[PDB]
Amino acid sequence: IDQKEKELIKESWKRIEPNKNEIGLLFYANLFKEEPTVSVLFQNPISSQSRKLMQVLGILVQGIDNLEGLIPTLQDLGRRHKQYGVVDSHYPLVGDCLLKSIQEYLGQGFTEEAKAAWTKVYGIAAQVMTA
Amino acid sequence: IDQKEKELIKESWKRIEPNKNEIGLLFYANLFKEEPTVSVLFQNPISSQSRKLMQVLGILVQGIDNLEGLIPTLQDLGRRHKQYGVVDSHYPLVGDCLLKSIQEYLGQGFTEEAKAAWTKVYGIAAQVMTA
Ligand code: HEM
Ligand code: HEM
């Protein structure tokens, strides 16, 4: 992640954050339609789940200048995901769906350059989570 | 529906409406989780679909004192639904899921009395759409 990518993340988050509740919920709707098999893994209220996901995305943005500082928390999160029945192959599907959902909700407000930066940040988070 | 029910619809809409985008999106997530098969019927972006659904709920509220007046609109809507592949048994599924989603998102802010009124209104709408 270069300084240009870090900037795009911070800038796009200013448009994501005010829309975070809707984006998170759209993401679940899209995920469950795209991959009908994974919805069985989500066993708590989706409203609450969405808030948790978007909170962590916020934490990634807040620490975007030092992501290594987040290795521990991301490792713990990946470990809990194993306990939820999540496997490595789920991660690209969720990443694709999340990025497509942000794109859908924000439209032109979300640039290709921003989407590319978020792709890399997600890939990094998923790498740490799956070890 | 009776006068008290009409009032409950109007008053409870004051809490539903400001949250309507979130409730709509949560509804599709819950719907697609509960019955993954229906998600194939939804061909257009879910963000736009949720807005359309919540627009019609708003119309039901606007017309709540004279639902008889909306019968032609609801009949047209029901006719279009048939074309989408929607069938009678889908209506209770959608109704249950919609009410549960409003309940989930608002928590105790969605009163037992308001929920009972909304249950009856959805039932009426469903009946007109499918008659
Ligand atoms: C960057 C990637 C991801 C992030 C930031 C993330 C974030 C979270 C968070 C914050 C929670 C709350 C529970 C906890 O903290 O342990 C959670 C739970 C969960 N996540 Fe993820 N997640 C990611 C990827 C995935 C993937 C790929 C899946 C695959 C389906 C997934 C499925 C689940 C499930 C099933 C739960 C538990 C739901 C329940 O409580 O029943 N997550 N995730
Ligand atoms: C119960 C009250 C319902 C209301 C108020 C409602 C509202 C709407 C509205 C406003 C549209 C936009 C298109 C149009 O106006 O014709 C729509 C489309 C649609 N509805 Fe409903 N609906 C209801 C019930 C259902 C049910 C029970 C199903 C069963 C799955 C369903 C599935 C669909 C599908 C598949 C579409 C088309 C999506 C697309 O554009 O591909 N709806 N609905």
mmCIF file of all heavy atoms in Angstrom, chain B residues 41-44 49 52-53 56 77 80-81 84 86 90-91 94 122 129, ligand 2:
data_model
loop_
_atom_site.group_PDB
_atom_site.id
_atom_site.type_symbol
_atom_site.label_atom_id
_atom_site.label_comp_id
_atom_site.label_asym_id
_atom_site.label_seq_id
_atom_site.Cartn_x
_atom_site.Cartn_y
_atom_site.Cartn_z
ATOM 1 N N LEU B 41 -35.412 -14.431 -8.423
ATOM 2 C CA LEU B 41 -36.460 -13.627 -9.054
ATOM 3 C C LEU B 41 -36.089 -12.157 -9.107
ATOM 4 O O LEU B 41 -36.618 -11.408 -9.924
ATOM 5 C CB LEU B 41 -37.814 -13.811 -8.360
ATOM 6 C CG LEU B 41 -38.342 -15.237 -8.198
ATOM 7 C CD1 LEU B 41 -39.634 -15.244 -7.405
ATOM 8 C CD2 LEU B 41 -38.525 -15.915 -9.564
ATOM 9 N N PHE B 42 -35.180 -11.744 -8.229
ATOM 10 C CA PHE B 42 -34.780 -10.346 -8.139
ATOM 11 C C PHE B 42 -33.610 -10.051 -9.064
ATOM 12 O O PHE B 42 -32.455 -10.310 -8.734
ATOM 13 C CB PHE B 42 -34.468 -9.967 -6.680
ATOM 14 C CG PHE B 42 -35.674 -9.961 -5.798
ATOM 15 C CD1 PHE B 42 -36.082 -11.115 -5.138
ATOM 16 C CD2 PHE B 42 -36.428 -8.811 -5.644
ATOM 17 C CE1 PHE B 42 -37.199 -11.116 -4.345
ATOM 18 C CE2 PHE B 42 -37.550 -8.811 -4.839
ATOM 19 C CZ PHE B 42 -37.935 -9.958 -4.192
ATOM 20 N N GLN B 43 -33.922 -9.486 -10.223
ATOM 21 C CA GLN B 43 -32.934 -9.322 -11.273
ATOM 22 C C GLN B 43 -32.280 -7.949 -11.287
ATOM 23 O O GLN B 43 -31.195 -7.780 -11.841
ATOM 24 C CB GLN B 43 -33.566 -9.645 -12.629
ATOM 25 C CG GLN B 43 -34.059 -11.076 -12.687
ATOM 26 C CD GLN B 43 -34.441 -11.521 -14.080
ATOM 27 O OE1 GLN B 43 -35.252 -10.886 -14.752
ATOM 28 N NE2 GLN B 43 -33.853 -12.622 -14.521
ATOM 29 N N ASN B 44 -32.936 -6.971 -10.673
ATOM 30 C CA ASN B 44 -32.410 -5.610 -10.651
ATOM 31 C C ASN B 44 -31.664 -5.293 -9.358
ATOM 32 O O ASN B 44 -31.772 -6.045 -8.385
ATOM 33 C CB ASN B 44 -33.540 -4.615 -10.917
ATOM 34 C CG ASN B 44 -34.040 -4.692 -12.355
ATOM 35 O OD1 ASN B 44 -33.261 -4.562 -13.303
ATOM 36 N ND2 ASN B 44 -35.333 -4.937 -12.523
ATOM 37 N N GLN B 49 -34.358 -1.730 -5.733
ATOM 38 C CA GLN B 49 -35.561 -2.486 -5.376
ATOM 39 C C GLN B 49 -36.090 -2.075 -3.998
ATOM 40 O O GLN B 49 -37.287 -1.902 -3.813
ATOM 41 C CB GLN B 49 -35.295 -3.995 -5.418
ATOM 42 C CG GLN B 49 -36.461 -4.873 -4.932
ATOM 43 C CD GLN B 49 -37.778 -4.648 -5.683
ATOM 44 O OE1 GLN B 49 -37.798 -4.248 -6.846
ATOM 45 N NE2 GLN B 49 -38.888 -4.918 -5.008
ATOM 46 N N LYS B 52 -38.021 1.102 -4.146
ATOM 47 C CA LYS B 52 -39.349 0.895 -4.717
ATOM 48 C C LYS B 52 -40.317 0.279 -3.709
ATOM 49 O O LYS B 52 -41.460 0.718 -3.590
ATOM 50 C CB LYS B 52 -39.279 0.029 -5.978
ATOM 51 C CG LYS B 52 -38.514 0.675 -7.112
ATOM 52 C CD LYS B 52 -38.387 -0.269 -8.300
ATOM 53 C CE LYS B 52 -37.657 0.401 -9.463
ATOM 54 N NZ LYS B 52 -37.489 -0.539 -10.604
ATOM 55 N N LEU B 53 -39.865 -0.750 -2.994
ATOM 56 C CA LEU B 53 -40.716 -1.400 -2.010
ATOM 57 C C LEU B 53 -41.127 -0.408 -0.925
ATOM 58 O O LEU B 53 -42.300 -0.346 -0.551
ATOM 59 C CB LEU B 53 -40.002 -2.575 -1.357
ATOM 60 C CG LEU B 53 -40.728 -3.130 -0.120
ATOM 61 C CD1 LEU B 53 -42.078 -3.736 -0.467
ATOM 62 C CD2 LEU B 53 -39.841 -4.144 0.577
ATOM 63 N N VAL B 56 -43.808 2.093 -2.012
ATOM 64 C CA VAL B 56 -45.168 1.576 -1.940
ATOM 65 C C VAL B 56 -45.693 1.484 -0.507
ATOM 66 O O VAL B 56 -46.867 1.770 -0.253
ATOM 67 C CB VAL B 56 -45.352 0.226 -2.686
ATOM 68 C CG1 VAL B 56 -46.746 -0.338 -2.431
ATOM 69 C CG2 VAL B 56 -45.144 0.429 -4.178
ATOM 70 N N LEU B 77 -50.149 -3.712 -9.465
ATOM 71 C CA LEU B 77 -48.908 -4.197 -8.882
ATOM 72 C C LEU B 77 -48.901 -5.729 -8.818
ATOM 73 O O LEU B 77 -47.894 -6.374 -9.138
ATOM 74 C CB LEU B 77 -48.723 -3.588 -7.484
ATOM 75 C CG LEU B 77 -47.383 -3.890 -6.824
ATOM 76 C CD1 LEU B 77 -46.235 -3.293 -7.625
ATOM 77 C CD2 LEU B 77 -47.373 -3.401 -5.354
ATOM 78 N N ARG B 80 -48.316 -7.242 -12.281
ATOM 79 C CA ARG B 80 -46.898 -7.190 -12.614
ATOM 80 C C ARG B 80 -46.092 -8.247 -11.850
ATOM 81 O O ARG B 80 -45.160 -8.842 -12.397
ATOM 82 C CB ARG B 80 -46.328 -5.793 -12.375
ATOM 83 C CG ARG B 80 -46.979 -4.729 -13.248
ATOM 84 C CD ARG B 80 -46.185 -3.437 -13.288
ATOM 85 N NE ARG B 80 -46.086 -2.804 -11.975
ATOM 86 C CZ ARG B 80 -46.924 -1.879 -11.515
ATOM 87 N NH1 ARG B 80 -47.948 -1.464 -12.251
ATOM 88 N NH2 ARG B 80 -46.735 -1.368 -10.308
ATOM 89 N N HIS B 81 -46.460 -8.489 -10.595
ATOM 90 C CA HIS B 81 -45.785 -9.523 -9.807
ATOM 91 C C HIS B 81 -45.944 -10.919 -10.400
ATOM 92 O O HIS B 81 -44.989 -11.694 -10.433
ATOM 93 C CB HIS B 81 -46.238 -9.509 -8.356
ATOM 94 C CG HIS B 81 -45.506 -8.500 -7.537
ATOM 95 N ND1 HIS B 81 -45.633 -7.146 -7.756
ATOM 96 C CD2 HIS B 81 -44.588 -8.640 -6.554
ATOM 97 C CE1 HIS B 81 -44.851 -6.490 -6.918
ATOM 98 N NE2 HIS B 81 -44.204 -7.374 -6.181
ATOM 99 N N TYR B 84 -43.381 -11.507 -12.781
ATOM 100 C CA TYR B 84 -42.051 -11.727 -12.203
ATOM 101 C C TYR B 84 -41.859 -13.175 -11.748
ATOM 102 O O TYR B 84 -40.753 -13.574 -11.398
ATOM 103 C CB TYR B 84 -41.814 -10.806 -10.985
ATOM 104 C CG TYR B 84 -41.996 -9.334 -11.258
ATOM 105 C CD1 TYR B 84 -42.511 -8.485 -10.280
ATOM 106 C CD2 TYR B 84 -41.654 -8.790 -12.486
ATOM 107 C CE1 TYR B 84 -42.689 -7.131 -10.529
ATOM 108 C CE2 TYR B 84 -41.827 -7.435 -12.744
ATOM 109 C CZ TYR B 84 -42.346 -6.610 -11.762
ATOM 110 O OH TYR B 84 -42.519 -5.260 -12.027
ATOM 111 N N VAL B 86 -43.851 -14.383 -9.232
ATOM 112 C CA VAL B 86 -44.356 -14.419 -7.874
ATOM 113 C C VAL B 86 -45.675 -15.169 -7.806
ATOM 114 O O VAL B 86 -46.542 -14.996 -8.658
ATOM 115 C CB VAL B 86 -44.527 -12.990 -7.322
ATOM 116 C CG1 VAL B 86 -45.027 -13.031 -5.876
ATOM 117 C CG2 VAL B 86 -43.205 -12.255 -7.451
ATOM 118 N N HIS B 90 -45.810 -16.990 -1.849
ATOM 119 C CA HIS B 90 -44.715 -16.063 -1.577
ATOM 120 C C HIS B 90 -45.149 -14.937 -0.646
ATOM 121 O O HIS B 90 -44.320 -14.384 0.082
ATOM 122 C CB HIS B 90 -44.198 -15.438 -2.871
ATOM 123 C CG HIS B 90 -43.303 -16.334 -3.666
ATOM 124 N ND1 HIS B 90 -43.282 -16.324 -5.044
ATOM 125 C CD2 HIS B 90 -42.386 -17.253 -3.281
ATOM 126 C CE1 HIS B 90 -42.399 -17.208 -5.474
ATOM 127 N NE2 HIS B 90 -41.837 -17.780 -4.425
ATOM 128 N N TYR B 91 -46.431 -14.567 -0.696
ATOM 129 C CA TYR B 91 -46.898 -13.405 0.081
ATOM 130 C C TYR B 91 -46.772 -13.531 1.617
ATOM 131 O O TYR B 91 -46.286 -12.607 2.265
ATOM 132 C CB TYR B 91 -48.300 -12.940 -0.356
ATOM 133 C CG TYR B 91 -48.291 -12.226 -1.689
ATOM 134 C CD1 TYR B 91 -48.335 -12.942 -2.881
ATOM 135 C CD2 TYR B 91 -48.228 -10.839 -1.760
ATOM 136 C CE1 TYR B 91 -48.318 -12.302 -4.103
ATOM 137 C CE2 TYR B 91 -48.207 -10.179 -2.978
ATOM 138 C CZ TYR B 91 -48.254 -10.922 -4.150
ATOM 139 O OH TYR B 91 -48.244 -10.290 -5.363
ATOM 140 N N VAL B 94 -43.027 -13.192 2.468
ATOM 141 C CA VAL B 94 -42.575 -11.804 2.383
ATOM 142 C C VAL B 94 -43.130 -10.981 3.550
ATOM 143 O O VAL B 94 -42.406 -10.187 4.155
ATOM 144 C CB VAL B 94 -42.920 -11.153 1.015
ATOM 145 C CG1 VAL B 94 -42.846 -9.625 1.086
ATOM 146 C CG2 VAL B 94 -41.965 -11.663 -0.073
ATOM 147 N N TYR B 122 -50.537 -5.426 5.672
ATOM 148 C CA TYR B 122 -49.845 -6.264 4.688
ATOM 149 C C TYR B 122 -50.789 -7.341 4.154
ATOM 150 O O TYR B 122 -50.799 -7.641 2.949
ATOM 151 C CB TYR B 122 -48.608 -6.948 5.286
ATOM 152 C CG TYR B 122 -47.949 -7.839 4.252
ATOM 153 C CD1 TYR B 122 -47.073 -7.305 3.338
ATOM 154 C CD2 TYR B 122 -48.261 -9.198 4.158
ATOM 155 C CE1 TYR B 122 -46.481 -8.093 2.368
ATOM 156 C CE2 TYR B 122 -47.674 -9.997 3.183
ATOM 157 C CZ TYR B 122 -46.785 -9.430 2.284
ATOM 158 O OH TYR B 122 -46.176 -10.190 1.297
ATOM 159 N N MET B 129 -53.548 -7.746 -4.164
ATOM 160 C CA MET B 129 -52.577 -8.052 -5.215
ATOM 161 C C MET B 129 -52.825 -9.420 -5.865
ATOM 162 O O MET B 129 -52.517 -9.617 -7.040
ATOM 163 C CB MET B 129 -51.145 -7.965 -4.666
ATOM 164 C CG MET B 129 -50.687 -6.518 -4.443
ATOM 165 S SD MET B 129 -49.160 -6.389 -3.492
ATOM 166 C CE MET B 129 -47.963 -6.947 -4.703
HETATM 167 C C1 HEM C 2 -46.485 -7.732 -0.370
HETATM 168 C C2 HEM C 2 -46.453 -6.489 -0.837
HETATM 169 C C3 HEM C 2 -45.448 -6.150 -1.941
HETATM 170 C C4 HEM C 2 -45.158 -4.916 -2.346
HETATM 171 C C5 HEM C 2 -45.752 -3.615 -1.767
HETATM 172 C C6 HEM C 2 -44.181 -5.016 -3.407
HETATM 173 C C7 HEM C 2 -43.624 -3.962 -4.092
HETATM 174 C C8 HEM C 2 -42.899 -4.072 -5.260
HETATM 175 C C9 HEM C 2 -42.571 -2.991 -6.154
HETATM 176 C C10 HEM C 2 -42.991 -1.517 -5.981
HETATM 177 C C11 HEM C 2 -41.853 -3.489 -7.163
HETATM 178 C C12 HEM C 2 -41.276 -2.676 -8.340
HETATM 179 C C13 HEM C 2 -41.783 -3.157 -9.696
HETATM 180 C C14 HEM C 2 -43.259 -2.896 -9.820
HETATM 181 O O1 HEM C 2 -43.742 -1.858 -9.292
HETATM 182 O O2 HEM C 2 -43.957 -3.722 -10.464
HETATM 183 C C15 HEM C 2 -41.685 -4.906 -6.933
HETATM 184 C C16 HEM C 2 -41.003 -5.791 -7.743
HETATM 185 C C17 HEM C 2 -40.730 -7.109 -7.443
HETATM 186 N N1 HEM C 2 -41.215 -7.838 -6.364
HETATM 187 FE FE1 HEM C 2 -42.561 -7.070 -4.978
HETATM 188 N N2 HEM C 2 -43.911 -6.354 -3.606
HETATM 189 C C18 HEM C 2 -44.676 -7.091 -2.738
HETATM 190 C C19 HEM C 2 -44.685 -8.464 -2.676
HETATM 191 C C20 HEM C 2 -43.762 -9.288 -3.295
HETATM 192 C C21 HEM C 2 -43.647 -10.706 -3.074
HETATM 193 C C22 HEM C 2 -44.546 -11.518 -2.128
HETATM 194 C C23 HEM C 2 -42.629 -11.167 -3.803
HETATM 195 C C24 HEM C 2 -42.157 -12.634 -3.874
HETATM 196 C C25 HEM C 2 -40.848 -12.888 -4.005
HETATM 197 C C26 HEM C 2 -42.069 -10.061 -4.530
HETATM 198 C C27 HEM C 2 -41.026 -10.117 -5.425
HETATM 199 C C28 HEM C 2 -40.738 -9.144 -6.356
HETATM 200 C C29 HEM C 2 -39.872 -9.314 -7.501
HETATM 201 C C30 HEM C 2 -39.115 -10.583 -7.916
HETATM 202 C C31 HEM C 2 -39.867 -7.970 -8.213
HETATM 203 C C32 HEM C 2 -39.113 -7.611 -9.499
HETATM 204 C C33 HEM C 2 -37.654 -7.349 -9.177
HETATM 205 C C34 HEM C 2 -36.992 -7.023 -10.494
HETATM 206 O O3 HEM C 2 -37.107 -5.855 -10.950
HETATM 207 O O4 HEM C 2 -36.365 -7.940 -11.094
HETATM 208 N N3 HEM C 2 -42.790 -8.919 -4.203
HETATM 209 N N4 HEM C 2 -42.339 -5.233 -5.759
#
